[PDB]
Amino acid sequence: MESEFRVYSSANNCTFEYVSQPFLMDFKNLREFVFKNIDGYFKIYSKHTPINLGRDLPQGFSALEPLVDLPIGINITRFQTLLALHR
Amino acid sequence: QSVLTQPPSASGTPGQRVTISCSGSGSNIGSNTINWYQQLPGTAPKVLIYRNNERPSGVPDRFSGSKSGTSASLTISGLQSEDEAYYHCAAWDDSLNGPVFGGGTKLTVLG
Amino acid sequence: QSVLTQPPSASGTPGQRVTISCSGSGSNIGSNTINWYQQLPGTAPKVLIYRNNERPSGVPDRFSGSKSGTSASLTISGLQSEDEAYYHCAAWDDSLNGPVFGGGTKLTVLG
Amino acid sequence: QSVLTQPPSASGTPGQRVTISCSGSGSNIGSNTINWYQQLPGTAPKVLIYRNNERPSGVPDRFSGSKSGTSASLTISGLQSEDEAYYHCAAWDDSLNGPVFGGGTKLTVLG
Amino acid sequence: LQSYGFRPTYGVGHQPYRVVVLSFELLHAPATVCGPKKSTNLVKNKCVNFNFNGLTGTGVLTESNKKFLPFQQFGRDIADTTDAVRDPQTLEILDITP
Amino acid sequence: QLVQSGAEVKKPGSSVKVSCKASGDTFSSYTFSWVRQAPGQGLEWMGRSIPIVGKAIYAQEFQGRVTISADRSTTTVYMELSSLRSDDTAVYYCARDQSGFDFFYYDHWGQGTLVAV
Amino acid sequence: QLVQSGAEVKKPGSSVKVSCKASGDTFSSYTFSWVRQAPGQGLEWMGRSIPIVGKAIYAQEFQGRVTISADRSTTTVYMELSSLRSDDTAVYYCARDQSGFDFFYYDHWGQGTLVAV
Amino acid sequence: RFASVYAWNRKRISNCVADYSVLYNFAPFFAFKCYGVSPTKLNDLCFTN
Amino acid sequence: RFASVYAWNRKRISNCVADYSVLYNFAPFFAFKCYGVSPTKLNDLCFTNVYADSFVIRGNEVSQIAPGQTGNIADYNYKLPDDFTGCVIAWNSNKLDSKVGGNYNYRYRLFRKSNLKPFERDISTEIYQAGNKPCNGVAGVNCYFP
Ligand SMILES: *[C@@H]1O[C@H](CO)[C@@H](O[C@@H]2O[C@H](CO)[C@@H](O)[C@H](O)[C@H]2NC(C)=O)[C@H](O)[C@H]1NC(C)=O
Ligand SMILES: *[C@@H]1O[C@H](CO)[C@@H](O)[C@H](O)[C@H]1NC(C)=O
Ligand SMILES: *[C@@H]1O[C@H](CO)[C@@H](O)[C@H](O)[C@H]1NC(C)=O
Ligand SMILES: *[C@@H]1O[C@H](CO)[C@@H](O)[C@H](O)[C@H]1NC(C)=O
């Protein structure tokens, strides 16, 4: 069971849908994303790298490779993160 | 006999409200205003009411016009003993591109 | 029975001016012209007058049309002994987007 | 008695193919379809065949219609012991602008 | 509301005509609706006029030995000129020589 | 599914109401015909009714002495007959016009009321 | 100058061809109207035809049951009427629309065919 | 079934590849009138909505 | 009478003295647009060859008569090139031309295979056939009148 009704309560008139497989999880592993919305095009860049125990933002270098490129046409100025709570 | 037919005659008791109405084709009488004039015999006539509601200055209050749709009606409340006259419709008309008048009822105040 | 009502019958003395009139809704008869035709029985009819004033060539002079407002009237001065006929109105009409005709008075010249 | 004449009676042996035909004026019976209904006595009738070939669902197979020109014929192959009935023609007709029916043959299955 | 006719015994001018009205507007959406593109036999070792998903140019197409990162479509050389592309249909890297 | 009103004897020259009620599917989409059957004999056609715009349409044999309308508020069709005689002592059937194409075929077809005089 | 086809009696529900033929001047420049006259009564308007592009245009009273076209190969105009009854037993006139300006006036006007049923 | 003209059916089209080859394979097409475009040059423009 | 726009009237002007005083005394002149010249300085230049083209068009179409445009009348009826040194005069013509009942004597082209070259007239009344099946002269599908 995995529900959705605690996030929102209305889903009227969406003009865009998308389904891709991974997007996440491809010792500990750092996962880095960059979101930027320019000219109606949402751009998500992502990179998942295995790291050793450190400051969780390790001294090194790893370039972020692009993931999706969505034609949304939306003003975006606020954001927050979803979670799961296992009841 | 022109484009706005006027009933020819009306009379009756003095001191009473009466009404007189004018109704023609919808080219002008249902599309534009209906002004009203009064003709005193032996002399030049006057003006009574423009835009169907508003009198001009100087003229009395007891006359009142109404553009009740295609029926333009003058109501005369408290009829007096001096206005035995000829009452004449008037309207601008876009068909003939001009004012068009009517015969005017020969309204007579009895003694 | 169509959109321009024609009075059905008229007759009387020969050698005299007479008139016949056509009057319908202001959609066409007060907005566009009124041509007039003549129907001789047993054969194909003719044309009499276009644009309410001007005859065509060949046809005589004594007929005359008038677009006196909504009253379109043919006057026949000096009536003669050959045109016992059916006189038919005609008008362009923008409502039905077409010419529309009328029943035509069965005008009969006596002996 | 209506515009599509039905022969009134028919009977004969059971267990055999029989035919019944309907033929009227070419205004409808040679210009439009011929549907067929069945009337069971004491109750409301049914439908049997539309567009002269296709049955509806549920009804059996052994009935078959044909629009053999002006002759519309039902063939009943393998006649059974329950459909002693009144068989009724039907057709759309453009003259009266409506469906028009027929008297229906009182077809009787013997014992 | 008054109903229509549409009787099979009507002439043209009375029969029902289905109407579909398309309305188009083109302002801001980057990914939107076009017609298919259609391609052609990708010849090799010949001076041809080529177009690789937008890249318009001229030159000879040859088998390459470069390796693009799965997200890259074409490469450029020093001095910023396109020198390799990836065929959109077959996904092979080809050098462009002058 | 259609259901009918009662069947009862009246007096000559009167005015008679009969009502058919629909149940089972939508109601406004369909139309409704009304046919008449003399007892022991064959059908004919009496009056068509369109519950969309309230328009009625009739036959030139029996135009005028019957009116016919319906309401989609409770899907009831009312046929009122006037000038009855000993020639209308007949069974009356409302019917669902199967719209089809090229055929008429008279659909689910319901059940009607006897009328005696 | 216009000339007409024959005048003849038909049967109800049939399809009837009538043809008008022009002679005397050019043919494509003009247009052609088609009017109808019940016997003893007044005219009305039935169908306009433009021999330039082959387009036809009609009246909302009698759209559909008549078609009308023409050919400039021999300057012949064909009007085909369908769904005749005892209400179309009428005289039918092709006519030259005088284009004029501001008036219609119905020009040289030709001669038409009787149609009986 | 098509809706009548007083309550006409409306649909927005989402992003796709729009082959107009189909839509040509339908009928003898009593009227085919583009206004802001031309049907011979329909397979190269890319409208937003 | 002016010819319609599909077969437009053309005239070459021979040598003369060209008073443009006339041509000013005509109308309120809904459009008077010279391109290679200016109308205030028209009576001093001396052009070698002068081509007068003339037709009738609809009311909301006068903007299309211009060098370098695209529309249903500039595609393949009258294409004005970008080397245009002439002058387009266009005025309202009501009552002389617009007969009641319409005036179907004028017409214009709708469908064509190829776009027209600049300054080209065609009286090609061929039945346009841009479909799979052959039509060969009948007004049906995949073959309209132009
Ligand atoms: C696009 O579709 C074409 C279909 O022709 C694909 O080409 C085939 O790909 C398979 C898989 O490797 C080969 O076995 C076939 O031999 C190819 N066809 C030909 C004619 O060579 C092509 O791979 C597809 N491209 C993508 C990116 O999916
Ligand atoms: C989507 O539908 C809603 C209806 O509740 C409407 O208010 C809104 O304008 C629509 N969205 C767009 C982008 O038109
Ligand atoms: C998005 O923002 C721009 C400028 O900030 C504004 O012009 C536009 O109306 C906004 N759109 C919406 C849907 O709010
Ligand atoms: C002359 O040729 C051109 C192009 O070849 C063509 O557009 C034009 O119609 C031709 N003129 C005549 C009179 O054939």
Describe the structure concisely for a colleague.
With 87 residues, chain A is an all-beta fold.
Description:
Chain E: Residues 28-50 are annotated as: Disordered. Chain E: This is Spike protein S1. The structure is cut from a larger assembly and holds 4 copies of chain A, 3 copies of chain B (111 residues) and 2 copies of chain F (117 residues). Chain A is an all-beta fold and 87 residues long. Helices cover 0% and strands 31% of the residues of chain A. Chain A has a 3-stranded antiparallel β-sheet, with no helix packed on it. In chain A, a hairpin with a 2-residue loop joins β1 (29-38) and β2 (41-50). Chain B has one domain: Sandwich (Immunoglobulin-like). Helices cover 0% and strands 36% of the residues of chain B. In chain B, the strands form 2 sheets. In chain B, strands 1, 3, 6, 7 and 8 form a 5-stranded mixed β-sheet that branches. The radius of gyration of chain B is 13 Å and the shape is globular. The termini of chain B are far apart. In chain B, 25% of the residues are buried. Chain F has a single domain (2-115), classed as Sandwich (Immunoglobulin-like). Helices cover 0% and strands 44% of the residues of chain F. The E-F interface holds E 1-3, 8 and F 50, 52-53, 55, 102.
Keywords:
part of a larger assembly; 9 chains; A: 87 residues; mainly beta; 0% helix; B: 111 residues; Immunoglobulin-like; five-stranded mixed beta sheet; three-stranded antiparallel beta sheet; 8 strands; 36% strand; globular; binds a molecule of 2 linked components (NAG-NAG); binds 2-acetamido-2-deoxy-beta-D-glucopyranose; Spike protein S1 (chain A); viral protein/immune system; SARS-CoV-2; viral protein; VIRAL PROTEIN-IMMUNE SYSTEM complex
SSE map:
This is part of a larger assembly, with four copies of chain A, three copies of chain B (111 residues) and two copies of chain F (117 residues).
Chain A lengths: L28 E10 L2 E10 L14 E7 L16
Antiparallel strand pairs in A: 1-2, 2-3
Chain B lengths: L8 E2 L7 E5 L12 E5 L23 E6 L2 E6 L8 E9 L4 E4 L3 E3 L4
Parallel strand pairs in B: 1-8
Antiparallel strand pairs in B: 2-5, 3-6, 4-5, 6-7, 6-8
Chain F lengths: L1 E2 L4 E2 L5 E8 L9 E6 L5 E7 L6 E3 L7 E6 L4 E7 L8 E6 L16 E4 L1
Parallel strand pairs in F: 2-10
Antiparallel strand pairs in F: 1-3, 3-8, 4-5, 4-9, 5-6, 7-8, 9-10
The complex binds a molecule of 2 linked components (NAG-NAG) and 2-acetamido-2-deoxy-beta-D-glucopyranose (3 copies).
Protein name (chain A): Spike protein S1
